[PDB]
Design a protein around this ligand. Structure first.
Ligand SMILES: CNC(=O)c1ccccc1Nc1cc(NC2CCOCC2)ncc1Cl
Length: 339
């Protein structure tokens, strides 16, 4: 078998001529030539079986990606693994080869308003499908948005995803959270477990702001610093928005802060399209119940050149204590169709 950067990458003979791409959340990713489809593809090597948590994340990523079928969601083309559970130590996920990701593009390229509009449309179109399956992505960020040479955008990594559960969303103040800090909604730090669709809309709002300026809008250095940044731009929450927070520790923390005024979007982004800023404001709304939903966002005037609900499909059917041995068996069963 071909070896890449001191490690086995056992994908042959269908996939040959390997080249290192980089490290992702699951391990090494390479490009390879697919001798059947006559194109180069991406292959991610995953070695999760020694840890229950790695098994849970890998199973979620595979189960969700195989059930979903949408132009703006990365697909799984093939899955390579040993023929028996005993011999299975790694799993390789084959996906379409992308040219870049939005994180890398934002680091070096200025986006035209036309590119911002197109990218936002595609993120929201993919998100409508995810939310229609009652699934929350929970880790939307520029590095999870991959792009091909013609700027077709694919949402990636469903490892932190969950089925929406609005009834069990409430929790205490400063409750630990897994998802990427800069893209976390204010309620995560206050009273939310991140089990409602509004969590994803906030992250999209953060990505739109970052597309407008090439810099993260709320670059918090640690857990509570994240809320300082959000309130530094949005200003103090209204009495009505505080009344929606019943938890005393969270509400009292907010009441203890000096009054802060809103920084206007047009002063932060003087070159931005005014319709883009109006949609940004609706996505970056402090109160999650007043925050715009994905289908409303698609219908916003900023996206009128693309909006077509008949061409924004939904899922046909909607969608933690298991030991790692049981999870390995489920991963083996979930990947059986490619043998
Ligand atoms: C969600 N992120 C990943 O899956 C990932 C992370 C680090 C390195 C590669 C990654 N995957 C891909 C990478 C590419 N192409 C690269 C994209 C970045 O720029 C170089 C090509 N094509 C398809 C895929 Cl699946």
């Amino acid at each position: 078998p071909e070896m890449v950067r001191g490690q086995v990458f056992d994908v042959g003979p269908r996939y040959t001529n390997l080249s290192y791409i980089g490290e992702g959340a699951y391990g090494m990713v390479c490009s390879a030539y697919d001798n059947l489809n006559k194109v180069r593809v991406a292959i991610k090597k995953i070695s999760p079986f020694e840890h229950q948590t790695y098994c849970q994340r890998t199973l979620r990523e595979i189960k969700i990606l195989l059930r979903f079928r949408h132009e703006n969601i990365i697909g799984i083309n093939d899955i390579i693994r040993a023929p028996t559970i005993e011999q299975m130590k790694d799993v390789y996920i084959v996906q379409d080869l992308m040219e870049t990701d939005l994180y890398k593009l934002l680091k070096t390229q200025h986006l035209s308003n036309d590119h911002i509009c197109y990218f936002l449309y595609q993120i929201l179109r993919g998100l409508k499908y995810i939310h229609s399956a009652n699934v929350l992505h929970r880790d939307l960020k520029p590095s999870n948005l991959l792009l091909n040479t013609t700027c077709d955008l694919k949402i990636c990594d469903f490892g932190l995803a969950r089925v929406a559960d609005p009834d069990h969303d409430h929790t205490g103040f400063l409750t630990e959270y897994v998802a990427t800090r800069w893209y976390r909604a204010p309620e995560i730090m206050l009273n939310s477990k991140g089990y409602t669709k509004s969590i994803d809309i906030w992250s999209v709002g953060c990505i739109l702001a970052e597309m407008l300026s090439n810099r993260p809008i709320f670059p918090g250095k640690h857990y509570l610093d994240q809320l300082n940044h959000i309130l530094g731009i949005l200003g103090s929450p209204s009495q009505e928005d505080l009344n929606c927070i019943i938890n005393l520790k969270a509400r009292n923390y907010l009441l203890s802060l000096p009054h802060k005024n809103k920084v206007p979007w047009n002063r932060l982004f003087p070159n931005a399209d005014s319709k883009a800023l109006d949609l940004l404001d609706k996505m970056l709304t402090f109160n999650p119940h007043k925050r715009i939903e994905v289908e409303q966002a698609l219908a916003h005037p900023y996206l009128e050149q693309y909006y077509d609900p008949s061409d924004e499909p939904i899922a046909e059917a909607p969608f933690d204590d298991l030991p790692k041995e049981k999870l390995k068996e489920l991963i083996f069963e979930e990947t059986a169709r490619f043998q």
